[PDB]
Amino acid sequence: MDSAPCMWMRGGTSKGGYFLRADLPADTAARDAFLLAVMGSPDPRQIDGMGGADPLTSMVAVVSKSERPGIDVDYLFLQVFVDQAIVTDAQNCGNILAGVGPFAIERGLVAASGDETRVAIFMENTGQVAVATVRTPGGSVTYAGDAAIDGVPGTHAPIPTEFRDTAGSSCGALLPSGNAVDVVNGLPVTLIDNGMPCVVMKAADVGITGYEDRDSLDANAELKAKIEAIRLAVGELMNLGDVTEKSVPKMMLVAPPRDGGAVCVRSFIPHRAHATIGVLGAVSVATACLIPGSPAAEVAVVPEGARKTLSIEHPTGEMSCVLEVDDAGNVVSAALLRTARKLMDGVVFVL
Amino acid sequence: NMDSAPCMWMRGGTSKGGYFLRADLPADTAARDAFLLAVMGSPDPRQIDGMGGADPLTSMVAVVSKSERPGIDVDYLFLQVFVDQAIVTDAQNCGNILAGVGPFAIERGLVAASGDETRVAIFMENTGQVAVATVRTPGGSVTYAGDAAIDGVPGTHAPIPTEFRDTAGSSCGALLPSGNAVDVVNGLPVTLIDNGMPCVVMKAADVGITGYEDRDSLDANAELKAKIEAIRLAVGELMNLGDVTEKSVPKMMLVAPPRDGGAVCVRSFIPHRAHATIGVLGAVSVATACLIPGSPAAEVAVVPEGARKTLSIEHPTGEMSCVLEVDDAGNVVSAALLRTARKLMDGVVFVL
Ligand SMILES: O=C(O)/C=C(\CC(=O)C(=O)O)C(=O)O
Numbered sequence: 153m154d155s156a157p158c159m160w161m162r163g164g165t166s167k168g169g170y171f172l173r174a175d176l177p178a179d180t181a182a183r184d185a186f187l188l189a190v191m192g193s194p195d196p197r198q199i200d201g202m203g204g205a206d207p208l209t210s211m212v213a214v215v216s217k218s219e220r221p222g223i224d225v226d227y228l229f230l231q232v233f234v235d236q237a238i239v240t241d242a243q244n245c246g247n248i249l250a251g252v253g254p255f256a257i258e259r260g261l262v263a264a265s266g267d268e269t270r271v272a273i274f275m276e277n278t279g280q281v282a283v284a285t286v287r288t289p290g291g292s293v294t295y296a297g298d299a300a301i302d303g304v305p306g307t308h309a310p311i312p313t314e315f316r317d318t319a320g321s322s323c324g325a326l327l328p329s330g331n332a333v334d335v336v337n338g339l340p341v342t343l344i345d346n347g348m349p350c351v352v353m354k355a356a357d358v359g360i361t362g363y364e365d366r367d368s369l370d371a372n373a374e375l376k377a378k379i380e381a382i383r384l385a386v387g388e389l390m391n392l393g394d395v396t397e398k399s400v401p402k403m404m405l406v407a408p409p410r411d412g413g414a415v416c417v418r419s420f421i422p423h424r425a426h427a428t429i430g431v432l433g434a435v436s437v438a439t440a441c442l443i444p445g446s447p448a449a450e451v452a453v454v455p456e457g458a459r460k461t462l463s464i465e466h467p468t469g470e471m472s473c474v475l476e477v478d479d480a481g482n483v484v485s486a487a488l489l490r491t492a493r494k495l496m497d498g499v500v501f502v503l
Numbered sequence: 504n505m506d507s508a509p510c511m512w513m514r515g516g517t518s519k520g521g522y523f524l525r526a527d528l529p530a531d532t533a534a535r536d537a538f539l540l541a542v543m544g545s546p547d548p549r550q551i552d553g554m555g556g557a558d559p560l561t562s563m564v565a566v567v568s569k570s571e572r573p574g575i576d577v578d579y580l581f582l583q584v585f586v587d588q589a590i591v592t593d594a595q596n597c598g599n600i601l602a603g604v605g606p607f608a609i610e611r612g613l614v615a616a617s618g619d620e621t622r623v624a625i626f627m628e629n630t631g632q633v634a635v636a637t638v639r640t641p642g643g644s645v646t647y648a649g650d651a652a653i654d655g656v657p658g659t660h661a662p663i664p665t666e667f668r669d670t671a672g673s674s675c676g677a678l679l680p681s682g683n684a685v686d687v688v689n690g691l692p693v694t695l696i697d698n699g700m701p702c703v704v705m706k707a708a709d710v711g712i713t714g715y716e717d718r719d720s721l722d723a724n725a726e727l728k729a730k731i732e733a734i735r736l737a738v739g740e741l742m743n744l745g746d747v748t749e750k751s752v753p754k755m756m757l758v759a760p761p762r763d764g765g766a767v768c769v770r771s772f773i774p775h776r777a778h779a780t781i782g783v784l785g786a787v788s789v790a791t792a793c794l795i796p797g798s799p800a801a802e803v804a805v806v807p808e809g810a811r812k813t814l815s816i817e818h819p820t821g822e823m824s825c826v827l828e829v830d831d832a833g834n835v836v837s838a839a840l841l842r843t844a845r846k847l848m849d850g851v852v853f854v855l
Pocket residue numbers: 165166208244245246247248348399402421429430431432433434
């Protein structure tokens with residue numbers, strides 16, 4: 153097959169191609185080779201495909217109607233590497249998730265149910281369910297509205313998303329090492345998975361402030377080398393095997409908030425600096441803020457009460473994470489606002 | 504306000520952008536620009552809410568229509584959509600995006616396939632110049648598959664040879680709008696030249712680089728970029744380009760001796776980002792400058808002898824050759840260059 157139907161969408165602060173599962177090769181080696189060609193990878197410019205030469209604009213959602221009881225659609229996230237011939241399936245992606253609901257409704261996978269449509273989305277990569285609510289005025293998806301998210305110009309229709317049962321969905325526990333803190337290459341880190349495996353550490357401990365812009369961080373070869381050494385050192389401890397060629401864990405460098413939020417973060421995902429912050433990445437970081445003795449807890453400003461709005465500051469503003477904690481202080485849910493937009497709909501081609 | 508249009512996303516040469524039928528876009532320029540900005544996701548350094556790839560070279564538009572001009576198959580207007588300003592500019596040719604125009608026009612039925620290699624004569628509306636491209640149409644259908652390669656694009660595709668005649672002065676009114684082979688601007692000798700793309704040609708070494716740096720190093724060189732932009736703003740009137748402050752011309756061309764067997768090595772700012780490779784008509788202008796005695800380009804170039812000259816223009820990821828025919832007076836009378844293209848996505852683009 154040399155082409156496939158495809159909707160190009162912005163999902164949250166990321167961008168990529170949304171496919172029906174049936175339209176892609178069933179064999180995953182052939183599927184991944186096709187997706188590389190669709191995107192134009194490997195190429196630092198992605199000039200001969202639809203990737204935008206940024207991992208955050210080189211992403212794929214494979215969506216299908218679900219047979220799981222109570223679930224509307226199944227969603228597989230695939231990261232297409234920009235300049236390697238690698239497609240990875242080892243993580244969730246809550247930004248690209250934002251486009252899944254609207255894509256599924258437009259494609260008839262799930263019926264609109266009034267002016268707003270709840271969509272229960274099984275995230276195949278980790279086996280957990282997320283719930284998105286999509287504006288469907290008059291029974292049709294809209295992308296217009298009054299909502300805004302930092303990192304995206306303008307305003308769009310809101311897409312509230314809610315995540316439960318996130319802890320340990322990749323590493324088998326919230327803290328796969330069993331410790332709140334671990335010393336790695338002479339630095340305290342928290343190894344944490346509440347929907348995204350993360351290594352959380354103080355920006356100041358790897359020799360930056362945590363307030364640098366994306367270009368400054370991407371050009372900092374010395375910083376990138378130092379944190380890559382830590383990432384490779386903890387891959388097995390987080391039950392992720394050999395992470396050398398994986399996209400996980402995400403490296404989260406935290407600092408005290410500056411614009412009135414809970415914490416400030418710079419993320420490497422795992423090699424490129426994030427332009428903003430990942431959705432489940434932010435949930436893991438926000439969760440670490442609540443763990444006494446974590447580097448995150450030391451720099452964070454944490455509100456009182458069972459339902460905590462934790463503003464996570466990032467290079468171009470912030471993204472707020474509403475957590476509720478149970479009896480024992482465990483996070484039992486996380487809710488975040490996203491938006492999406494259909495950008496182009498048609499057929500993608502490969503040679 | 505228009506909220507969708509049919510659109511083919513293509514790679515044209517080493518560039519990428521949206522190809523539209525003229526009839527599918529707003530007739531009013533202001534409405535058209537607001538639509539195209541929104542299609543691309545501009546202004547936004549990351550172009551996250553549209554189809555632009557956060558680089559001027561992947562934020563380009565071609566507007567194509569069947570031509571009524573005798574002997575011309577299609578009319579093609581090139582539009583640059585700025586990445587992080589609300590500006591769409593029509594002031595230049597674009598010979599990379601031109602490569603997609605032939606195949607696009609045949610797919611869209613604007614020109615019929617003719618044999619297995621279809622000639623397509625293309626009127627470049629921005630300057631009134633014509634290019635002639637040949638498109639592989641085996642069995643009557645465009646193919647993008649083939650054995651040709653161009654530096655800056657992985658793999659191989661169908662060849663699209665292109666030939667340009669009557670190139671000189673199409674934006675500035677003359678090949679050398681100042682009348683001089685060299686002018687001194689901000690302390691350094693430059694050549695102001697237009698052989699299809701208005702350019703300021705200067706020695707890389709005179710502005711503090713070697714000319715062999717990679718694109719990332721050049722885009723990070725704020726001191727260099729400020730020096731170059733001050734020169735650009737100082738030459739707009741001399742080049743008969745009026746007020747260039749919000750324009751994308753002239754292109755700033757920094758030349759050095761060839762290092763990999765070519766005629767000259769170039770780095771180009773277009774005008775603000777460093778080029779990842781080199782523009783097609785920009786290269787023609789630089790190649791032409793190499794032939795002018797006294798030019799900075801002639802001082803660093805290695806120029807082959809003969810009436811037919813293959814001038815290899817070296818750039819950050821290899822080279823692109825310009826085959827120039829020159830007449831007895833030494834004037835360039837045609838330029839021929841190989842490009843390729845590929846259809847990437849076809850369908851409908853949307854805006855709010
Ligand atoms: O870290 C990455 O790979 C990029 C992401 C991840 C994300 O959204 C999430 O953590 O849920 C993104 O911003 O798209």
